[PDB]
Amino acid sequence: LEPFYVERYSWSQLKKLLADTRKYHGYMMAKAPHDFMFVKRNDPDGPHSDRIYYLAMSGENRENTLFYSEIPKTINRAAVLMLSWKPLLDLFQATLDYGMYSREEELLRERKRIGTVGIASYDYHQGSGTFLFQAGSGIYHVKDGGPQGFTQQPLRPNLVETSCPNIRMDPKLCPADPDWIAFIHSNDIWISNIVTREERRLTYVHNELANMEEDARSAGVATFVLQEEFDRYSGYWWCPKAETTPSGGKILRILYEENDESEVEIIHVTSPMLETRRADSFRYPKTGTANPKVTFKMSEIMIDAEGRIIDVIDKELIQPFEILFEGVEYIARAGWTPEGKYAWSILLDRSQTRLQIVLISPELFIPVEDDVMERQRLIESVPDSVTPLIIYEETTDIWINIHDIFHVFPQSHEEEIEFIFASECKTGFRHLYKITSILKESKYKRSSGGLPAPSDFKCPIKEEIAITSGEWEVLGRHGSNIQVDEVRRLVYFEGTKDSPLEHHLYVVSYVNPGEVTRLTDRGYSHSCCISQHCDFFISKYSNQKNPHCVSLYKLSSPEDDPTCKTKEFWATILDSAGPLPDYTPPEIFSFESTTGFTLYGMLYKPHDLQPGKKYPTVLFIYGGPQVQLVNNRFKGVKYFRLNTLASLGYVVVVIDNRGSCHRGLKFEGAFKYKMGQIEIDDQVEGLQYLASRYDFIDLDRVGIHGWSYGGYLSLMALMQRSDIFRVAIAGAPVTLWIFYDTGYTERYMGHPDQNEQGYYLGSVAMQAEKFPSEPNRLLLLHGFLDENVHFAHTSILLSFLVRAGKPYDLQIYPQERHSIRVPESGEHYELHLLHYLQENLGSRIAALKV
Amino acid sequence: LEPFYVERYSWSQLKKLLADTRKYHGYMMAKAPHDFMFVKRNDPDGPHSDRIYYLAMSGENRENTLFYSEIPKTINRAAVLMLSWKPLLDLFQATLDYGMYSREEELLRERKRIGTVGIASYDYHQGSGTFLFQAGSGIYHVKDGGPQGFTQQPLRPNLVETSCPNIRMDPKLCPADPDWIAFIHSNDIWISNIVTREERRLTYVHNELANMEEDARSAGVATFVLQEEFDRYSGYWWCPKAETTPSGGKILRILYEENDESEVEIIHVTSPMLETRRADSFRYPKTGTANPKVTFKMSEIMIDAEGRIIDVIDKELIQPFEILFEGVEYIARAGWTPEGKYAWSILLDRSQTRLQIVLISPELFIPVEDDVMERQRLIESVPDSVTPLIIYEETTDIWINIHDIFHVFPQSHEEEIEFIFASECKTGFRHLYKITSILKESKYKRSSGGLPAPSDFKCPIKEEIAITSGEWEVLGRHGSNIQVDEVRRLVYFEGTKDSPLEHHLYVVSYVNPGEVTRLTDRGYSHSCCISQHCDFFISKYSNQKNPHCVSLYKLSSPEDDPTCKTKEFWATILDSAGPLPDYTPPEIFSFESTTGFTLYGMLYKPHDLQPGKKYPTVLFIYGGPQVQLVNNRFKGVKYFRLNTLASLGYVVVVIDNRGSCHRGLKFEGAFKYKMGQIEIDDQVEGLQYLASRYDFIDLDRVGIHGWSYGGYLSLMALMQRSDIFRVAIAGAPVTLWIFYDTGYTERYMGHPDQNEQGYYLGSVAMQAEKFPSEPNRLLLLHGFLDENVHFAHTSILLSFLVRAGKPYDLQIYPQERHSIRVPESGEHYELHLLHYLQENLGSRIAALKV
């Protein structure tokens, strides 16, 4: 077999080639309809059953905004109904413009109002039809689908006026009174009345003028680790029901997280304003050090019969958070029971091996008092029966994977709570469990004076029915959740039962759980939303050949059996763009690993495959936890450049090694305490399977490339298996696990003290001497302003490479964080990546160079 | 002519080759005898006339310490006297060691006490024989050559004890009382009595506990710009004479600079402790912004007859510094007249085009008072006659070059001061001028209430005799100074009269200045010290072939003419190592530039020069002001790797372009406002002269490499003349002149507002689009912790290169400042530099790669 050498293009020629292939790919950067809501018309005379609201991007270079579509009562099954997108909102037209201006100073200004005025999410109040949403700086409201009815034309968004000097974040409607909204301003919670215009600051925890070294406190906002490592952004939750006062007014309540980051390590990331030559101070809990001091607080808001604020009482926990919630480090999730009788929270220990679900009575909260005399009176005025109620507690020798599934049923019995919750802890696969918990009066008496025993708040489990089971998981992360039909007593859920390469929508009874019914067509992976009324569901679906598509499906039963659930295609929302020109999909393959697992992979055959010729091989890798790269989804948008590599004459390989997502907790836990030590074996094992099966794979010229965990494994690969991998391009790599944060590192590797050898062997920076003594094999890429994987990882690694006398190549993106945003940086990266592979792997110059 | 291609060594092979050639070069990193002092024995019976003291490094891996040598009354002129080095000090042996330890825990500890306990400079008090010197942390004293006599054995250094918690800096003997020393501790001035042990803080300007954002004040210490750009480190000066009190005690005085850096821009340089991921706050006056607020203060120290402190009165100027010294930005130099009647200062305006020499009476200083009532009394109690006296004022359309020459004669007449001073301002060459200035009572009266006119303090010039003249300069920087023989009425000085490639020692009368007599042998460049007694001088001399050598020379006259001065070789201090093996010196060449100047250069012919073969050419460059690379000095130590390049088969060229040092102010001022715009023309012009003269220079394969201004011109070269320069390796380059400091940038380029186009065209970062679209031509090297040329220069330049879509190669040294210290970094740099030139210029792979 004679070796194939890629065409050796100049830098200018490659720049043009990459620009040419990018030109017809402008429509791709445009968000598909999401955040769906079904509102019933209730119009016997009218042709429509439901109006659906949703966020979407009408096209390329356009604003993510609110649209609505009409769901007919009947369809012509001969034809294919394509729903029209009606804009819910009028063109904002940024107010306080005035000036004079002209056509030449206005048609250029309209280009600047694209990325700014875009809606990321919205709130809705069914009873009033009130929409609340942030759009750029402003917080706006409109009404549709409530008592006022249904508009046939775009509505003008109503600016919520403010005296607040800074940007208002995280706006939320009060479910108990849609005249009242809350929002965050300079790390404190405010409320505002969209009718009376009354604006009121609830928390006085942060002073914007003060230094961050001094002022380390915030309220209603999730800290770094919770946003980046636990996918939680909001830190405050409205009580969904109001308490009527004797005066004829009401009490509105907000549960909120209060964080003190005083003892959290301060690091300095370079200021984006590079001319200043300054750095921003940042609270980064590096593994082994202090997380923020977290507690629960409640804001009690007394409103009179006319809707004016009487008083605001800030309340703290009767005892310290550390006493009431022994061994809890993280508030992963929080909210209210539907009646708002209890606040709930999903709490985690530092090791992230113990999850607790805790009901917190508002009665646990007493007014904040400096006077210890008056304070001691308030403590005693609260009964001993009032206590935190741990309605659930699970453990695992691997780790708790936090999800968004948790449905609380209406409280029928006084001393019982009934809920659905997902868990991997029982069978090592995420399954739905219906649990009933007895709300026992605690054996612990607060009056006695002693501290509580580890399990004095634990509630007995009356019932724990498994709703699902098997060698497959229910999905509860990154949009995946459940819809509970409390009427027909069903639960709709996404899962991997039919294949781990395809997400599918299933339905099943939660009273007499039996046969699980797939509602989505095989041959596609599905992301699904189910109507609150459980008579419709939308699917965002793709496969390897066909771009993403959004269709609506009506649910019904056979006349004779309401248990049996069927679906019928109703209408298309977003039509698929269809097979993309100059994109060849990859082939999904698999191989029986000597590890006892099936490992899946994607293979990109070189375009215009010549017979009896071996080609250079780029292995694209991530290989870290919480990610699956290999599945039956369209890859021609996100991983379009793996196709471009193939077109230039590269074999491209992707392998989901042990640790990957959607295969169960055991397959994931494979590398617990051992990160870096097992991933490249699985990559080589899969790479050697392909080489024996296909003769066109040249193992003499294998490249490896990845970002984040991919860049980390790219370095580990050149370090461990220089016999396999000629070149390694490492993007934003983790080089030293003691530098990375608490939430991620401790979850997979434990505390540094209890895994000295795991941390050492897992850190590439500590093994610089093991890198090749040949240049043109190692290339480091890093954004200079990266907040997640700091540039320090690279700079420390380089420091040790210089000591060890090893060569390296380096590219910096001075104005980029982790994810490259500014197009010029992305174009330069793509250009340099191809040129490097060309010059140091692909071409014949590369072969002569050794 | 067939092109020569260098041997293509592996990275490991080059590493070994560079280590092999570095092995026999350990003795080179060892300081030659310096800081000479001559003390007369006055021993009619004894064989010695003088004892000489000096700092030196006995050998490689040894401590810079005090030695002494004996100067005989007569020499055997048949033989060559080689003076023996007698150690003045006993082995320090760091006290407070205690512990237990052993031979294996002590013979390893002695390795750690090499670089630590080293003496950089020393003070001496002739009258007492008292030596004062910092050695590591401690401040020590010994006695020799005073009333106590001359030791024949090493003396034990006496630790000056302290209560100060931090390192004491900048120790100085009080010339009026050698029991008293002063020093800096945490940016404040202290005094300490080495007999009574009394320790007293004089200034309360800085609090170490406070933040540098808040606490921006310091006393007795030169700020960043003065240290880095004006070669001044000390900020306080003892009055050389004490004032006897009526009590039988005395008043000692310290003039000091007090700096407020409050309004100076704060930048963040990465912390050397890379694991912290923190940055150090730093006061960097970037060009166009505020310099420190500077003023003069005087500490008045009342001592009783027994030597105990009575009181300490801190005094400020009677009027603000800005009022008394109109338009003065920089205190370049300061001191006292020999009698200590006046404090003197050399003051500069922001543009550095006006120099003033000002006498400041102690009477100008009044006690510091908060009470405006008591303060107004003190102002009025000082006469109007007491006023600042500007004894000299010069200007230039180019710039003032600050030097260390300024000799004040004993004050004979009451209203006259007589002094020698050097200046380029008259003839455009630095020449010695004897000036007499009339100390007129100022026309300005402070009582009147008005502010003074620009020139109310100007003293009339009674006399201004030119002592030297011609197309050659007197040397007054970086060790070069004058010795004035007040007896024979001569001045000894260094100059370039015989050649601009050789420094020489000259003598001349300053009463009847006539014929200038060279005292040093032609065929060498000389660095000279002249005995205070003016009957001896030492020369540190080298040429291109012969390593540095230190010899002593006795001065005398012919019997018949004391005006005529001759020299006789007396003894050798440091013997030359002699021609170094595997080092070929370069040839000094010159060419008549179309600019109307002779430009000098060095040429390294390729070793084992093959006939009828053209070789690849590396142009090594600095090309910035205040530096001459080309002269008749040994280059086999500092520029040894230019020889290593030659040995691998590279032509190496060095050219002192216009702007270079030692050619006069006009030749230097060539690029005023125009930095970057003229240097590469001169480099190409010289490169094309060599190519027409020698056929072995291949102009197809020219590389360029430099650091600081060299790295800057290396980028300018690839930008302006990509037709000449294939590759450019830029080390710590200035890429953007608005980022560099006030003292340097404004001196050569003026204020940014009055040179918009000079700054723009002079900044490579603003012209990224003009770089080549071919890779493997541009390489950036930078220390990550550089305090002088910040990494920002590189990071901004890269930012614009990414926008322009241009390729680049990059090496960082994460633990290095401007000058690479840690050997591993230097080894890696040398290794990568050769490998890069090999792969992208030298070898045939480089030719195939285009």
Ligand SMILES: *C(=O)C(CC)(CC)C(=O)Nc1cccc(CN2CCN(C)CC2)c1
């Ligand atoms: C890199 O791999 C990194 C840091 C950016 C860890 C070193 C990482 O990927 N972290 C991470 C944290 C939380 C969730 C996820 C998974 N997430 C990644 C993005 N895709 C599109 C969805 C899932 C990763």
Ligand SMILES: *C(=O)C(CC)(CC)C(=O)Nc1cccc(CN2CCN(C)CC2)c1
């Ligand atoms: C670089 O060239 C730089 C910064 C380090 C200016 C951009 C510079 O060289 N500055 C500089 C400042 C003051 C004096 C000198 C001259 N000095 C350099 C070292 N040699 C050995 C003695 C003379 C340079």
Ligand SMILES: [Cl-]
């Ligand atoms: Cl139920």
Ligand SMILES: [Cl-]
């Ligand atoms: Cl005189």
